[PDB]
């Protein structure tokens, strides 16, 4: 019986541990703070669904609560690693033209995918017609910016929900997190913050992809004996 | 099959329910990971409403008692020639330098601002500071 | 004990600055197109200035300059809008180059 062994040793084992990939060591509140992740937009831009996550307003500039960012960031990183470990297609979506090169490079480095360009209508809801009937859609979508260039939710956020694809998202104070599966409240404008998210999601993915290899080598040793 | 009703329930509930019903034969790749480590809030669509009447936002203004001293220093002396270096995480400005002195002298037990301010202003001059009291 | 986020907030160089209007800060030129100098001063947004004609050649990518902060974020709400229209930059006046 190969199904029982394969399922248990590979798929079910990592899901039995609280932090199977030790992603909590990748970031700290001091690291987040030093990256200016707590800096939000002004109070006149605030979204009312982002209020639970706002610590306060420092002279009419919303300060994001990094205590909840850390708990949310771990949950988002944990999901990413488990999906990278499970051979899931991860798409990185952004429209912030200042970071399109960074995010496209980062996606290539971790062997994953990026859509930092104008999102054509129906890429997800009409993929078997835009690509081919046997195309495989992403299993996870990471939004590093959730607003398009007219300050409104990226169309893919809704289309991912329609296609039943979980999403990870950096949600600033002016963003709408109602449909994002794993929102991570934090600044998405400062280069330091965007560099940090890319560093974290790259590592989480890389590390998770190695461990998938470093637990099928053990399968080989166990297979012989 | 799938349900594209992104406004009814969440991707989890919808998926979960379609599996139970027998429509989705195979749990999607992400299903088991979500079930094990679900997010703090289930991603359910909600329509943003306006606050009419007396409803206000619960976000409060971040004030610290040191702010009163900072304001006074800026009113009396204003932003000194010292250029703020926001890159250094441990940077201290002449304002907070002034504040620290003020705060430390308060630990002694002085409860008067007038006498305390005259002392602090000259105690910081004992350290060697550039201040202008008239402007 | 790991410092609480609140603790960090009190003692951050940004919090002790208070109001940003007419505050001299040090910025670093990180991007240039034509004469537009994009200057990160240590906040949420950058601040595009213009190359001073006095010593234009000396304002190059990476140069540290002295700025006069006017606003941390240029926003305003306009007639019939439900939110503010943010430009996604700060307002500051480029005084010159920092000299040691």
């Amino acid at each position: 019986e190969d199904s029982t062994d394969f399922n248990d040793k590979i798929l079910n084992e990592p899901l039995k541990h609280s932090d199977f990939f030790n992603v909590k060591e990748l970031f700290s509140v001091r690291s987040l703070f030093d990256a200016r992740v707590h800096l939000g937009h002004k109070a006149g831009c605030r979204h009312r669904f982002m209020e639970p996550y706002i610590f306060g307003s420092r002279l009419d500039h919303d300060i994001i609560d990094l205590e909840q960012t850390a708990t949310h960031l771990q949950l988002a990183l944990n999901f990413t690693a488990h999906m990278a470990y499970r051979k899931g297609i991860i798409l990185f979506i952004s429209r912030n033209r200042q970071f399109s090169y960074l995010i496209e490079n980062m996606a290539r480095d971790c062997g994953e995918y990026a859509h930092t360009r104008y999102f054509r209508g129906g890429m997800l809801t009409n993929a078997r017609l835009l690509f081919g009937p046997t195309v495989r859609l992403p299993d996870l979508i990471i939004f590093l910016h959730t607003l398009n260039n007219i300050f409104e939710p990226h169309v893919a956020v809704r289309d991912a929900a329609k296609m039943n694809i979980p999403t990870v998202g950096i949600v600033d104070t002016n963003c709408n997190p109602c449909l994002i599966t794993y929102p991570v409240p934090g600044n998405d404008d400062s280069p330091l913050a965007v560099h940090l998210y890319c560093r974290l999601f790259q590592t989480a993915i890389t590390r998770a992809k190695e461990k998938r290899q470093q637990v099928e080598a053990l399968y080989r040793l166990q297979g012989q004996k | 099959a799938g349900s594209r009703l992104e406004t009814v329930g969440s991707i989890f509930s919808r998926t979960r329910d379609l599996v139970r019903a027998g429509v989705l034969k195979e749990k999607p790749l992400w299903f088991d990971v979500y079930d094990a480590f679900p997010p703090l809030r289930e991603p359910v669509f909600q329509r943003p409403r306006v606050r009419y009447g007396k409803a206000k936002a619960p976000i409060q203004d971040i004030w610290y008692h040191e702010d009163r001293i900072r304001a006074k220093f800026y009113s009396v002396y204003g932003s000194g020639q010292r250029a703020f270096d926001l890159f250094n995480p441990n940077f201290k400005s002449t304002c907070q330098r002034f504040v620290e002195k003020y705060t430390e002298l308060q630990k002694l037990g002085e409860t008067d601002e007038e006498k305390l301010f005259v002392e602090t202003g000259k105690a910081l001059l004992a350290e060697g500071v550039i201040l202008r009291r008239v402007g | 004990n790991v410092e609480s986020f609140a603790s960090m907030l009190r003692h951050s160089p940004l919090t002790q600055m208070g109001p940003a209007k007419d505050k001299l800060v040090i910025g670093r030129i990180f991007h240039i197109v034509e004469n537009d100098l994009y200057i990160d001063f240590g906040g949420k947004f950058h601040c595009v200035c213009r190359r001073p004609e006095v010593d234009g050649e000396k304002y190059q990518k990476g140069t540290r300059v002295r700025l006069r902060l006017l606003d941390l974020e240029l926003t305003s709400r306009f007639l019939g809008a439900t939110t503010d229209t943010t430009v996604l930059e700060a307002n500051a006046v480029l005084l010159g180059i920092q000299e040691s």
Binding site: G56, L59 | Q60, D61, I62, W63, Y64, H65, D67, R68, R70, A71, K72, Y74 | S4, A6, S7, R10, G18, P19
Partner: peptide, 26 residues
Amino acid sequence: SNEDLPISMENPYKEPLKKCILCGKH
């Protein structure tokens, strides 16, 4: 609880309210 939490104050940086040139003049 903790002592480092924001104190519920009124804005100390509030500027004096702008009065017109003729304020207080008959």
